[PDB]
Structures are given as structure tokens and as C-alpha cells.
Design a binder for this molecule. Sequence first.
Ligand SMILES: [Fe+2]
Ligand SMILES: [Fe+2]
Ligand SMILES: [Fe+2]
Ligand SMILES: [Fe+2]
Ligand SMILES: [Fe+2]
Ligand SMILES: [Fe+2]
Ligand SMILES: [Fe+2]
Lengths: 291, 292, 291, 291, 291, 292, 292
Amino acid sequence: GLSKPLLELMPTLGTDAFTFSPIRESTVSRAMTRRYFADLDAHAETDIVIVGAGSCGLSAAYVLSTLRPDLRITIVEAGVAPGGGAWLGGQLFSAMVMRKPADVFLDEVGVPYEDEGDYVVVKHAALFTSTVLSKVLQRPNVKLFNATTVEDLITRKHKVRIAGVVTNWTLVSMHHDDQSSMDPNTINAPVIISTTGHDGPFGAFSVKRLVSMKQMERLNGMRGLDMQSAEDAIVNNTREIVPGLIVGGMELSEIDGANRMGPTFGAMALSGVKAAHEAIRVFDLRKAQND
Amino acid sequence: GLSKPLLELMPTLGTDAFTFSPIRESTVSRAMTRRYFADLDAHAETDIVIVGAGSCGLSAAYVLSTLRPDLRITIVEAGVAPGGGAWLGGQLFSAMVMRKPADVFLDEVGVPYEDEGDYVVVKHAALFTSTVLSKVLQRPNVKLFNATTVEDLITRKHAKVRIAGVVTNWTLVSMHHDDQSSMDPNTINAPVIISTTGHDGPFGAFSVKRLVSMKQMERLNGMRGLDMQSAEDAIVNNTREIVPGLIVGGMELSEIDGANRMGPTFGAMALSGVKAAHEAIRVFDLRKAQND
Amino acid sequence: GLSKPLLELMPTLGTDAFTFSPIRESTVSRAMTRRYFADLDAHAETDIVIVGAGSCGLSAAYVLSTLRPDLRITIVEAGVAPGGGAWLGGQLFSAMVMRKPADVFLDEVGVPYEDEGDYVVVKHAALFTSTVLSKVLQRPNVKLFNATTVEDLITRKHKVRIAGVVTNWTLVSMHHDDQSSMDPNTINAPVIISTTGHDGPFGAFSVKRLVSMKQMERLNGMRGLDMQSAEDAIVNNTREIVPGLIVGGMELSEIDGANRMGPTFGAMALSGVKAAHEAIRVFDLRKAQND
Amino acid sequence: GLSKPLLELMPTLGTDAFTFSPIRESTVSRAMTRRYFADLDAHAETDIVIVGAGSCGLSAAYVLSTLRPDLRITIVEAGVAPGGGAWLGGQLFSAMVMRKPADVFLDEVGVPYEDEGDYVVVKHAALFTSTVLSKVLQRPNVKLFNATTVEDLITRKHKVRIAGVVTNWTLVSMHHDDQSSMDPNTINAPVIISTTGHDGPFGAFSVKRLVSMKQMERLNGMRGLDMQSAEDAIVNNTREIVPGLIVGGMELSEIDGANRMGPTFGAMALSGVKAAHEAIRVFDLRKAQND
Amino acid sequence: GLSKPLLELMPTLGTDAFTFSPIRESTVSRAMTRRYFADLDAHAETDIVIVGAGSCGLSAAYVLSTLRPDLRITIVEAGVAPGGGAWLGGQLFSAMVMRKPADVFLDEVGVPYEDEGDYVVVKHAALFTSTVLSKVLQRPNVKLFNATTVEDLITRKHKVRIAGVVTNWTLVSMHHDDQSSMDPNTINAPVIISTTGHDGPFGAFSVKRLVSMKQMERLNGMRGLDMQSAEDAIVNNTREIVPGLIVGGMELSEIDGANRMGPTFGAMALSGVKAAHEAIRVFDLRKAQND
Amino acid sequence: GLSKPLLELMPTLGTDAFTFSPIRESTVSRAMTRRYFADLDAHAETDIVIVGAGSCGLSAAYVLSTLRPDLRITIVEAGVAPGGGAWLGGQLFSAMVMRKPADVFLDEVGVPYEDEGDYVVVKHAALFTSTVLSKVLQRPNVKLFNATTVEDLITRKHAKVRIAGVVTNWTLVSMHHDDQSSMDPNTINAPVIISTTGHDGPFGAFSVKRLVSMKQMERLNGMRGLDMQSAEDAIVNNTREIVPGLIVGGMELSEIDGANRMGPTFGAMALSGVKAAHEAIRVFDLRKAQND
Amino acid sequence: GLSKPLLELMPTLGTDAFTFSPIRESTVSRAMTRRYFADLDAHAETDIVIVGAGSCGLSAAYVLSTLRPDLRITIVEAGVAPGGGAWLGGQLFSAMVMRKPADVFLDEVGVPYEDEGDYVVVKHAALFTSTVLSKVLQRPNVKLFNATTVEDLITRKHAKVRIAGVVTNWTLVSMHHDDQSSMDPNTINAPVIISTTGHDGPFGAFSVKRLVSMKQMERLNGMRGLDMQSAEDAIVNNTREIVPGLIVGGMELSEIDGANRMGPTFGAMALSGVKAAHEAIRVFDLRKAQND
Ligand SMILES: [Fe+2]
Ligand SMILES: [Fe+2]
Ligand SMILES: [Fe+2]
Ligand SMILES: [Fe+2]
Ligand SMILES: [Fe+2]
Ligand SMILES: [Fe+2]
Ligand SMILES: [Fe+2]
């Protein structure tokens, strides 16, 4: 049941006996700003940046921060609420289906499921996302800059190497026409993991920018749905696309022209894992090239 | 560190040695549709409904499902992503400030914080919401119907009315009752309905605004100015059954009561939800008897 | 005249003597969800999927389900209301004009008309569409999923073969930016009939998808209006375009680069009959390939 | 099975042997215009106008044209497709629930159903709608002006009497700003049956217009959902609200402050039957005054 | 001064002595539809069609109807108000400037002006347009179908020959999404004069359509503003682009890749004069081929 | 047949022989700006202002300028193309129906028609509008400020007020008073304003609605149902000075008066403008005196 | 301290002892139109035109009018408010960072800063823009046509072309060539045109995008990733006459050269402006001749 303290408080609610401690509005403001600037300052030069906090990005943020408490992890998520397209299953339904061996990841992060043999099923996709999300955030080396969009990549010569991200408020990135000029800010980082999902108004950002930066010819383009070949491809091909830039999740399907998997998350999760692994493998090198 | 099983799997990713088990698409479909219908069939008739998965509603769901595992709790949230305004702090910033004694609740749900004196600060608003959400979604007596909007209330006579459930529909359908032909809603019968849809706005403050148009209220006193000290006490202390079968809490309450807003501080949303759950339990049997 | 039971009921309406049997909301909600998820389950794996419930789609569904009571036909229509663009004639006018021998089909589905010589005229385009819709829906093996949009195609290797469709609620398909990620659902099928009208926000989906999937050179494009050359072209060329994918109706004009016919439905109707014949010709084989 | 004629034509589809009879585009334009304007001419002055071709209106239309084949019935429907909100059940599902004795009506029009006791269930709302639609449109005295909106009512003194409708193309009604002035057209009629659903951008037209013309104190507005009291109310209180104006269906709930029922069409059917009945009762009187 | 009849009526206004003759709404309705049907029926098959009632098209309509009373001239104008960009000069100002010898045309149509030497200035652009428009509309052989758009062209083999235009209500052409399918209407003609202004949403229709029909490599595109080199170009090159299709006005600039003149209308007027000539030159031959 | 000069020019078109006289863009620019700003200067202070170049406003302007060549007439029309809803008949059809004795006016403005006994029919609404528009613009004492919107009224005391001019701006600016930073309007002082802006709507019934928001009117009775027979009479017969310096006519009148609507018929609009012009003249001297 | 005249006036405010001098609306209207025409008439044919009043354009305008009081400078700014993206720093913040020697330019226009070694910081970007802006507008040979958009260019031959002016229109009109009937643009003839319209977007990078649509450029390399060190030197040292009559600078140049972007750092903009003004002088006599 409930904790004794909370049980002792409840009877108090709705009576003169209950009242919150005194507060001045400036206190709250400063409590927030002082802390946000701290983060903003400390992450202007970070170790690893993760663009897009969906099922894949979060799964990467988890593995990475657990194996490397020594590294600073800056997650830049466009929406106010993180989680990408993992709050639902298919056609607005709830059940999250993960084909084995993705269950190995569900165990790791402590997310229950029904075993069906070749695949497992999480009660609600929300349960998976909220749980993983909750744990990632507990990590002292992780910072979630939600409500923030990546408008461009910080580049360098040698062919180019990605060395950071150009950020701004998601709402600003969306109205660069509905106001006067609003310049973005930056984040210097040796390694960037992009998991912004597939092509769309917001998705497939890093992969599409490489093309506009005339570094890529074109995008093969996410192909039709074929669960069996899709998940396999996304997970095994998750890697450093260009120096300093690692791609995973469905964004990868855009650059590689892989099939899509529809309402099944095994690949996203393990692709998250693969990406964290890649970041580690490539880190020391890019770190040297960035300093 | 990571678990052995995962540490052993990692080296496999990126090699021909890795492959997911076989799967036929329709197995995925049926896997979801089967379970979803079950929910839809089971919750068509439920015990308690909570409208609005914002910080207040979630806190209510937590306390309620914990205290009454015997009760079926149906959470209906408009957005795909649940959490309301609990994903951020103030002005798009992160820090979640909670005035004491709300820290008692934080301890209850296991959410770390920095003791600052009269108030405490949670590293990130997101840290609180995901934790509570995670714990709530783990109770076997709770179901989250996200991307689902409450378009109306199910009423009963005693011209006074009793709220006996909600009229539902896919949020996307609610937002486009013009861009298409007629799309009727669905229903959920329930003895007690908790409404925590936040304050007035395109989507928010549904129940309260509906009571007015159903001609059960003279109008809404409307949310007033920001005064944290008087706002949080007012909200928490007055969470209650506003009309038979309907309890209001959170910022939706400020609209009918005409209370001040508190802005970027979540103590009241948490304890108001605690009180919302307490009220539900106090009233359940009575409404449950009246409803059947 | 009316039936006696109804004539007997009428005097009742408007009096205390009239009342509906008792009911509980949960009863109705269950009557619906139970039956829907039942279809949803039974059609996850189907025999023939018809994309687009317009004059062509409908015509094909009619002939098909009539000739093969054994096959399960899944009609996936985008709009809430079916009927495509066959509710009107031209420029918001009613009269539906069909050139012979399209009248043989109008005789099949029992739709009255005026014989003007080389063509026949249906009183209102709505008379055809409603009658046909009514008859197709009465078939025990036909299921209509209206408000459901086809977002992609389920593919398989060998060049590719179409093995089904990727589905979602039309209102979701239209707002993949007005919310967080919302994954689609799916339906497996050996043969898919696509009749989604010519290019536009909604139309010519299959053929456009074949291009964006990098399976087609480009769309020849729907050409000018020339009824005589157009109708013969749509009808005589309706066929399996790729293993498992049959295209007819005006969508066909997008890939074949045929002329348009404006306000005349003979071709749409007979293209439907042709599409039906094609599904049958090609069925057993694609079926074997898909199991 | 199919008809021999159609079975004999099918093999021909897809061969040089097949070809549509000669045609010239101007023949198709004239075929439609000549007819559409014949209707415009005959209906400019009609016997009964029914606004909104939804389940309630379509039902009323069915009974009115069958009982009085002598009267000209003019149906004005805003949408391109008629049927209102009777193409689906609730939350986009298909099953149409009808509480008894509404099954007597389903018997009348020939729409099959499963008997569940107090209520019967029609396979798919569309089957009911398309079926009834087909029959109404078959009547020689009925005319469906779809894609046409009622923007106002024609009035006369003695308080006022409703004597017709002000019409226009729906698209014009929706864009009285996106262009220069576009005047409406007219249809004189002694009795007007308004069945345009509950309030919304399109709905509850005549009921709201009475208010704006300062004839009504206001709209009590549709109340909460309560199937048992809503349907009994809507059906029993369908009547002539003002001389010349008979309101039924869900539009009546706005002026009466009646509860809503949701995904159940029992009332819409019988309110329609009763609206038609009231039409007949009041016809001679209004016709005498209108002339 | 006013006319005696009017002067005698005036004092009557605002007194009980003034009243309009008896009317019934249906009378007015029938007065319009009957004449519109007549027009819609007589023009389904016409001699010459002019797309776009702007300064250029209108000039062409004038000259063409005046030199050939025997021919039927069908003007299809998208906007509700005809005139295109000739209701104003540049930057919302009023003065209409025409370089000589354009003044020769102004003399012809009876439009006063100030001579400045190389150019003449018309008091207000509206003056020119209202006068030409008034004279064009007076001709017994001219019909103005405004509020109507040309969505496509009618084609014939032999490369293709333009034999008419696909029409629809402008509002319907702008919302082929915001509703169900709405088929267009047709008009057969041996020669079509397109003067739909330069590129944009509505503009440069026929030229752009020649590309989408794979008849043109691309549009050279309207170039920079060089009044002196542009107007001569527009005028001297106005001619039959494809058999049956004459392009003039600024639309011509799109296909020829010519400079623009901005706020000066000599070219437009003389281009129209030229257009009418081409139609006459080419008429008998096209007429022959089209029948 | 065509003129000889034109007939001699046609053969030239299409040959290297045809060419336009020399020109410098700036010459054209100055040709326009000079004249326009001349208009702005002269009309800033005018005699009579007509807001709304519709069938009623145009008829009023025609009668006014013809009976009073001495007065300066300033027409302010929101649309780029003037003519309001006088380009079409009903439901996008052409024919323009005018009941008698409006035909007396059609003879005045030189517009042909088919006599049907109790009413006459003009070939195309457009014929009427373009013809009248043409004869109005020709008068030397009239200026047409198209693409210009009247956003407010200029007032003076005798609390009762007197309308003494219009507040103006480019229509495009009137519709985007958010889509940019602040954009102040301009002004036109005038002792008499004839407002003929049609019935309520985004653009319509400007003055009548403004009188209300200026708290000089209780509320608009609002345009009523359609009844041609009683509507036209009421519109023509009650056209007049509603308030000192403000004459209202056409369909804007039905909004304040609460009169029926006539739909696809124009007799009343035409004779209303005629009455509007008669009233301006009756009232002019008095208002002018007060205004100076 | 304030001025004595103002100090003596204040006590008057809020008493019957205060009142403005008499006025008649028409007077204010004529005071504005009269002057606007003067400008419109004098600039139709001008010396140097600067498209885009952003930081770069503004800087160019300053340097140019200060070195050539004899030249008439016509600035066309699409927005109501000038200044471009120079009202803020990055992510909506204030501080304007300029890397040296860009500080030389701030000393010239009198804008304070904190020296930080290799760079300096102007309190708020608004200080730089407002100061520069103020100083530029004071110049008697400068004219700011704000709320005005360059829809196209004036071209001449020597298929090589020369730029000889700009096709103009009210910005709001430029944005609605579909929301009305045809609205022709006006013109401005000039020998040299400095285009500084920021980088690609609905309004940005105009001349550059136009050179391509006019079929004078193979394509646009497109602005590349953010790399401040290579970006700023590149934009500044490559600012030049791209085509006879057209000088390009600021961030627009990045579109045509495929140079890196610099983000929230304005050093390059200011010195790119100085460079553009300089190029215009170097090129002026020659183009002036070619234009007459
Ligand atoms: Fe930028
Ligand atoms: Fe509804
Ligand atoms: Fe997706
Ligand atoms: Fe109107
Ligand atoms: Fe079409
Ligand atoms: Fe203002
Ligand atoms: Fe233009």
C-alpha cells in the first residue's frame, strides 16, 4: 500500500490543517533558470549527443550512460514530450510487440511482457517508453533537452566530419517565417547519434541534411513494409554513417533504403543498443579529432 | 552495469550471427487488436474513469490503483503522449519545483529531488511524469486509452443530473468533425468520473465547461491571476465531487472555482490528485449503487 | 405501399404508447467492438484486398464476391463515405453517363437507365453507387473498412511482389505531424486490387508507391481528356502490374499515361469487371507464393 | 451467379475485340445539363423539401415518397456523398445498433440484421444507408440535389411561416470570403423537413436560423448522452416546430434540449418516419397558405 | 442630366407610392437556370474558346467577336470577377500605362487617355477593363462563363491537337480534396485561345499542361523585367503553339522564356488583337479537322 | 467592323516591323505614383464618400456624380475588382433579374434587357456592372480607390456622434493586422458617407456593425429570411441617413433594420443607390456646414 | 537628467492645462502622402539599391552613405520592422557576439561592447541594430522603403544579363498573389544593386534564387553546415559583384557559394556589409555609364 507519511497526510487534505510552505514566485523562476543555465553551459561542449528521444534514441541513451557514467550524454528531443512514436502500437492500439531476442533488452530495463514464443508483448507501449525514459533520466550523466530541435549539423573538413548540432526551440524551428530572424544556438560534440525516425516534417533530419550539404547523392528512401527483412537490416547496419555521425532507428531505413517494420519495436530497441556500442567504439578517435 | 544476457548479445549486432525470430505481419496485428478489443470490451463498463493523464490525473491514478486494486481504473487521455504539462517546467525549462509537503508524495512514488527548504526540486519535470506513469501502467487494474478524447458525458436524471460515464472517440476524430462525414462517438459507463483535463483552452477543462452548456451551471468563474501561495492551497483543499458522479481536480478546478493559477510548480497537482482519489473512494459505493 | 407492421407502428409515434426497448450504453459499445475486432482478426490474413471503394473498386468487389463466395474480400476505403467520385456527374450535376456495352453491367447489378443509343444514362450517379454498394455489402464474404487509408504496401522479394497493405485510420494518415508517432497496422494478402483514382493528395497511391519504392522509372502521368481513346485504354489494360498487384480505374491512367474521360463511368465499371477477372486468373499462383 | 450477358462480355475485356460505342464529349455534357436543369426547373417550385440526407432524412424520404407518390420530394444535401453520419458506428467501427421496435423499419426497407433481443444489429451502417439510399433514389418523384447547401429559409408572415429554402453549392457556402459576392438560388415549398443533425459547423441549420431571425429565444442545446431517454424523446417529439418547418433527427435535440444517444440509429429511423407522417398531416394546410 | 423617367421615379422612393411589381422566388430562379442551361447547351460545342478574361483575353474577345459575328465565342473565366490583373496598375496604384501604338486600340474600344508622347495613360485601369468588358458582353455571339475554371484540355491524336477544354466550377477545382470525387464538364472547340496570365496557382494553365502531358520539354520560364524587350516579344510571338491552341498574354511569357513588363498593358492589348487574328487564320483548318 | 487604324496595324503584328515606342521603367512608375498621390492629396478632404463598389454603391455613385458634377466623389472599395456580388446571378449562374420599375434605371445606365412583363432580365449580371462601372469611372469628378478598405469611421461629438469621414488602409493590410507589426491607417475627411457594404460577413456590413461597437446602437436586428416581395420594398423605401453624416443603403441596411433578404434579384439594390444618392444631396449642405 | 523643456511640461500632463495644438485629419494624411510621393518619385531612378535591411544590409548602407553623400541610397526591406535577424542572439537570447576585427566596425557606429579577447559582446543585439539603424536613417541621401518586397529584377542584355533595378511591391501583396486578382508590381531603375536578403527560405535569398530561375545559374550550391571559423572569413572575403549590376553579401551569399553558416555570430555580417559598400563604389561609375 501507501507509505505511512502519505497516509498520514491524506486526512489533512480538504481541511484548514493543510497548507503548502510559503513561496515567492521569483524563487521558483530562479530555481528553474539557474539550473537550466547550468545544464546549458555544461552541455555547450558535450561528449555525446543523441538526436531524437524515441524508442531507439532512448534505448541508446540507456545502454550508453550505463556503460559510460564518465561520459556526458546530451539528448536533444524536438517534442515537449519525449518518446517518439512509442506511446502506441499500431492503428492507435496499445500492445507493443517485440520479436525475440529483443526480450533480452526488455529484461535489462525491467519492462514486463507476455511471452508468445518467437515474440513478446508489453501490456502497453507506454509502459516501455515511460520506464526506459524514467531510468535514463535518473542517470547523473544524462540531460534531456526536450522541446528542442536540431536545425543543422556542426561540420568540419575531412569530405566532412560531424562535430556538433545546431539547435533551437522546436516552436522557433517551425516559424522561421512567422517572425523576424531567430538565430539558433550550438552544441559542440565529437560524436552524434541521430535517431529522428523516417522522412517526414520532423524526421530523417541528419540523413537528409547530408544530402543538402551535398555529401550524399540522394536517399534510397524507406521501402515498403516487410517485417522480416526490415528489423534485421536496421539493427545490423546501425553504425557510423559519416565521421562523427551515427545513425540508427527508422532514420537509417531512409539512407539505406531498407523496408519498414510497421508496429513492431524489436529493431528500434536493439538498434539503440547497436548505436550505443558504435558511439563507444568510435569515441576516443573522434574526441581526439575534435579537441 | 548491464546484464550478462545483454552483454553477450551486443557483440552479435552487426554480424550475420544476429537475426530476429521469424514473424508473420498478421501475427503482430492480431497480437494488438485481440488485446485492444479485450480492453474495449472490459472497460465498456468500469468503476472509475480518470479524464486527463496530466500530473494531477496521473497522481490520482497512482494513489487510486494502489488503494483499490479491486477497482477497474480507466484512464482516457486525448494526446498520444500522456503527461499533460508535466514534461517541462517553466518557459520550456526543465526543473520541476514542488512546495512542501508535496515531497511526501515524491517519496511515495520514488522520485528523487533536491531539498531546498520549503520546496524541493526534481532534476527534470520529465523524471517525475515517466516514473509515475511507469508505476501506474504496471498495475493490472489500470488501462491507458491514449489518443482517445472525451467528447461528452453520460448523464442520468437526478433538472439536476448525475454523471454516469463518458462519451469517447479517437482524438483525431474529435478534432475533425468537419473534414469528414458524420463520425459517432463510443461510450464508457462508470459510477464515478474524475476529470483532470487542466484549465480552459481548445482541449482543456472539459467537464466543467460541459456542465455549463448542459445548463447545470450559471457559468465558469474562470481561472484567475497567478498567485502561487493562494492557488495551491485553494486547488488541493477543494478537489471534490462537483456534481453526482463527477469529481474535479487539478487546474480544471480553478475554472469552476475561479481560483488563482500557480504557474511552474507541481505540488498542488500532485496532492490534488491524491485528494481526487480519496474523494473517489469516499463516493464510489454510493454512486456504484445508484448506477446499477 | 408500406408494410402493415410499420403502418401499425406509426400511429404510435408521438404518444406515450411509444417507447424503445430498454438498453445500456455498454451493450451497444460491445455490440460494435466485438463485431469489429472480429473482422479485424479474420481479415489480418485475407484473400483479396481492394484499395479504393469507388465505381471501379465497387464494381470489381461486386463481380469478384459474386463469382467467388469462397474468397474473402477486404475492401479498404479511405473516406468515411464510400463511393469515390461516383456520387455526381460532371460539375456537381447528377446524371451518370455510361457508353455501351457498359449497360450489360448495369443490368447485372439491377440499375435502371435511359437508352440513348450508343450510351445509356442513369438518373443520378447516386443510384448506381448506392445500389452497387448495397449489393456488395450484402455479400457474406465482403468486409468494408471505411475511414481506413492504405499508407504503404507489404512487399516480398521477387524485383518485388506485393503481399498486402499497410493500414491506418484515415484521420491519422492525415496528421502524421499533428501528434507523436502513430504506427500503422497491416493486412496480409496474395492479391491486391488498387483502384484509388488518379493522382492527388489521396489518389493513385499504389502506382506512386511503386515509384517512391524505386521499382518504377516514373509515372507517365494522366493525360488530356479524350473519352473515346481513354475508356478503351483503361478497360483493356487493367491487369496485374507486378506480382500480387492489380491496378484499374483511373489510377491506371497514372502509370499507363492514358487519357482521362471526365464524367462517364463505363470504363470505371468494366475496368472493375476486368480487375475482378484478373484477381481470379492470378489468384492460385500468388496464393501459393504467399504461403 | 452473374448474368450470361456479362459472363459473355468478360472474356472480351483486355482484347482488341473490346471497344466502347462511339461518343463525343459534348454529348455527355448535354446529357447531364439538359437533365439537371430540367430538375432545377421542376423543383424550383416543389411540394416537400427535405434538408440533409442523413439516416433521419433518408428514412423520412423513404416513407414520404412511398405513401405519397403524387408529391414531389426535393432532398437538399450539403455533402457530395449523402448518408450523413450513418456510414459508421461509433469510434469509426461498423456495426449499426437499432433498439426495437426500430427493426420494423429495417424490415420495411429490406436491411438484414441479427436479433439480439431488445436490439438488432445491422452488419455495417453503410448497408443500411446504401440500401435505403438506393430505394429512395429509385422513386420517380424524388430528387437528390447533393453537393447543395441550404444557407437560409424562405419566409412569409404569419411570427413567420417557412415557405422554402435558400440554396447554393456547398463549396460556395463555405467560401463566401474567398471570392466576390455569390448570391444563392431558391426553392419554394409549403412544407420543409429539416434533418441536419446536431450543432456544429454544418449541423442544426433551421433550428439555429430560427433563433437568428429572432423567432426563438435560444437553443436549449443538445444535452448529455443517455440512450434510453434520448431516443424516446427525439422520436415522440418530432413535429412541425413553426408553420412550414418540421424538425426531426438529431437536429431536434438542439431546440428541445434533449439528450444524445451516440452510436445507435433506432430513433433516427423512427423520427424520420414520424417527420414524414407530420409532413402529410400538415401538407394541405401549408400548401393552401403558400399558394 | 438624368432621364425624365428616372427623375420622375426618384421622389417616389421612400413613400407609400413606391413598390416593386409582384414576384415569386421560383420565377427568378427559373429565369436564371433556363438561360444558363440554354448557354450550357449551346456552348457545349463552340467555335472558339477564350481561357482567361484578363486584359489580353478580353482584347482578343473584343476583336474576335467584332470581326466574326458568325462565330460563337465562349469565354471561360476562373474568377468571379473578370478582368484579371487589369483592375489596377502597379503597387496597388491606379494609372494604366500603355506605350504606343497601343493607343490605337484604346481609340477602338472608346477609352479616353492622356498622351505623353511615347505612351498614353488611362485614368484608372478599371476604366479600360470595365469598358472593354462591357462591349465584349454586349455582342450577341459572346458568352462569359465566369466562376468557371479550365482544369484540363481536350486532346486528339496528331503530337496532339487541342480540341476543347475540361471545365468545372472554380471552387470545385480548388477543393478536389475537401470533398469526394467531383468530375468536370467539357466543351468541344476547334481552336482554344489561352491567356491565363503567367505562372502561379491559377496562372499559365495551358502551357504548364502541355508539359504534364509530355508534349513539352519544360517551361523556359518568365524572365526578368525589361519592358522594352518584353512587350515586343509577347506581341510578335502570340500564335498557335499547337494545333488548336493559341497562347497569348503573359502566359505566353512562360513558354517562350520572355521578359516581363510589369505595370504596362500595351502588349496585353495588342497581344489579344494578334490572338484574334491567329484564331481566324487557323479556324477553317481546325474546324474541318475537328468535325 | 473595326477602325481603320487598327485594321492597318494588325498585319504588322508578328513581323519584325512591329515594335513599341521606347520606354524607361521609371517613366511608367512616375506616371502612376504622380497621379495616384495627386488623388490622395485631393481626396484626403472630399465631399461625399461611398464605401462599397457593389451594385448599390455603384448605382448611387452613378446618380450622384451625374446630378452633381460639382461634388467630389470618393469611392473606397475593398476588393481589387469592384462590383461586389454583381458579377453573377444565383448559384453561379449568369442572368440578372430586376423587377419593375427598376428597368427605368437600366434604361438610364444604358443596359439592355429582356422584358418579361413584371420583371426584366439582363443577359449577364456582368453586363450591368461593367457598363455602370464604365460610365461612373468616366465622370471627371469621381475617383475609385479599389484594393482599399475602410477599417473605421471618423467621428465628432453631437454621447451622440456625427460621422465625418473614413479611416482607410490597403485591404491586404486590413486582413493581416497580426501577420506583421503595427500598421496604422490613413484618413479621408468627408461630411457625408454612404455605406453600401452588403450584409454581415467577414467584410460586409461595416458601418452598421461599427455603430454598435461604438456603443451608438443597441444591437443589429440582423438580416432576416428570404422574401423577395417584402424585402426589396423595405430596402429601397427605408434607405437613408441613419446617423448624422452616415447614409446606409443596399443590403447593409437589412442588418441594422432587420429586413428580409431578396437573394438573386437586383431591382432593390439599383433603386436603393438611387435613393442613397438622393439622400446624400438632401443632407449634404447641412453636414458640410457642420463639418467645416 | 532630462531636458528643462520636458521637465517643465510633465507637471502639465494630466491637467486641464494640457492639450495638443489643433489638427484636422486631412493635414496629417497630406503630410505623409506628399512626402511619400516625393520619395517614390525621386527613387524610381536611383543610384544604389540595397535589398534587405538586415545586419549586413544596414552595415553596408551605413558605410556607403558615409563615404558617398552624393549617392542616393534606396533600401528596400520586406518587413514592417527592419533589422532582419539582428534583434536577438541565438535561441531567442540577447547577447550579440562579434569576433574581431569586427570590433573596429562597432567603434565606428558607436556601439558599446565587452572585450573578451578574440571577440566582443554587445549587451543586446537590439543595441547594435537600433544604433546602426538610427545613424543610417539620419543620412540625407538615404531612404528606407520598409514593408516593401523585391518580387523580381530589372534585366538588360550583356545569354548573359546585367541587373539594372528591382521589381517592387507591398510585401503583403507579394504574399497574396492568389488571395486577390492580379496586382502588378512597380519598378526602380538603378545601376548597382546590393542584395543582402539572408539565407534561403520563403523570403530569404532572393536575387541568388532569381539568377537561377532566370536561367543564369546552373543551380544553388546551397548553404552548408555550421562551421564558424570557415564560414565568416568565406562570406566576408567573397562578398562581390556576382553579375554585372548585382553585388551579393551577408548570408544570401552562402546560398550561391555553398559556404558554411555561422549561427549566432554577427562579425561576418557587419564586415560583409563594409565589403559590399566598397564593391559598389568600385563598380558604380562603370555600371552607371552602362545604365544611361
Ligand atoms: Fe538562420
Ligand atoms: Fe454526433
Ligand atoms: Fe511510422
Ligand atoms: Fe449574399
Ligand atoms: Fe478527377
Ligand atoms: Fe492600429
Ligand atoms: Fe504579375
